[PDB]
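Minutes, project check-in

Agenda point 3 was the complex the collaborators sent over. CS summarized: two entities, 522 residues total, and the question is how they sit relative to each other. Sequences were read into the notes so everyone works from the same version.
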Amino acid sequence: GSSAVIKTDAGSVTQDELYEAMKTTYGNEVVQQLTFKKILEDKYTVTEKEVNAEYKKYEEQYGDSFESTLSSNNLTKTSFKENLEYNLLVQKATEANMDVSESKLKAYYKTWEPDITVRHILVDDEATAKEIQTKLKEKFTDLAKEYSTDTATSTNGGLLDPFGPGEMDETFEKAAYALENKDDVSGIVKSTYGYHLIQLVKKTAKEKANVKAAYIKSQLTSENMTAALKKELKAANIDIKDSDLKDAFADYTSTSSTSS
Amino acid sequence: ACGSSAVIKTDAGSVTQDELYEAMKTTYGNEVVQQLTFKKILEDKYTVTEKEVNAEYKKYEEQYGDSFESTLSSNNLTKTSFKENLEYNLLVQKATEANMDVSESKLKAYYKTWEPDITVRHILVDDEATAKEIQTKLKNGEKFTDLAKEYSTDTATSTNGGLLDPFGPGEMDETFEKAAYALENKDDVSGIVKSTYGYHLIQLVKKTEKGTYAKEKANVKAAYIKSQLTSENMTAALKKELKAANIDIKDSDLKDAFADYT
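CS then shared the predicted structure for the full assembly.
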């Protein structure tokens, strides 16, 4: 690896120098993923279509901004394709370790709620909201672009994505689900971000097959994923040949779900 | 045959050196090779002493204090890798200084705004009502340092009565800085200050009156150069150094490693 990847008047940067510079900082993290990818692809099938179906989901939402968001996260489409594939493999290994018995699903059903869609207005302090609180004296969407410091939603009347329980900020959501009918509005909520006002747009047999999807969703925790990978790692009988990389799997060799 | 050696063996097959190289390069190759390349070009032209790097290392280490190690790990750094980045950053600083106008007219003009370092204490709180409460306790005879330990959400300084390190102009939030230098005498306390972080009260500990330019010029020069080490100027300097280096990229995977500088 004495070959030059870059030449300068001051000398060359070689393959060797680039390899070792990268390895020192990123070697453990990358070799871990390469290792898991191999052992998992051996046991679990991911089809090119499965990767495509996942890919398109993301591709639709972002529209014009798709390619732009990849670059901002240091991704190409193909490198993104690879990451979706890796995530699916881990997802499969985690699901293989899930107990999806009727009793668990029936038990999960009582706590579960469907997704909720709202608008909101974000401001720095309660008095400004109080100005907004009295502001009706008129349209919620109009005052959102007028006052909301949430640049992601301000232009769009403060419209939020659909979201479920546990999945968004606790205080915000309590207030959201308390909403009753189309377009009626909350009191002032104080979150980590600031003070909010929230407006409802959409709320909704067991209708359970959705819950099955939701339960599996909720079980894709970092703990369960780590637990699943520990089992796979153990069954693979790995031997680390490069002693620089001996600590590459530290996050998977403790009684906890992480290193330190 | 090159890099065919296994770095890891598994029942499912081996991952080789080459595969690790190529995988790292895809994600981290551009950023790492950019730094290696600039370091080599800059090392050739500009002198950095170990004395400088150590002084910089100590600066940051004390500055972050207890939270030092935690912030390194969060940025995927060791002490060793961090020290290397400081050396690299200093090289970039040298190239930027070489691009600076440090003429007497610039310095004398900078002198007008410049001040010697100032030492203050402060109390940081979430809202104005809390600050007003503290202002009333101060009037009623409670101690500023006591109220810092009781109220201040600035964990870095709250235990020590809210004492901050000495700082000059430009180094802090502008609003904070104006309010601090506006204080006249030792133990004077500010009105409510509103920064990006929250609401402050500030107490003066030490202030020094600016001397003549002749007496202060070496201080003024150091501060001026420092104020010119902006992200804009450093970027400009690296563009200029890169163009002058006439580099030749051999690995087409890395063709865009310097996109921000061409």
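Noted in discussion: The longest strand of chain A covers residues 195-202.
Follow-up: revisit at the next meeting once the mutant set is ready.
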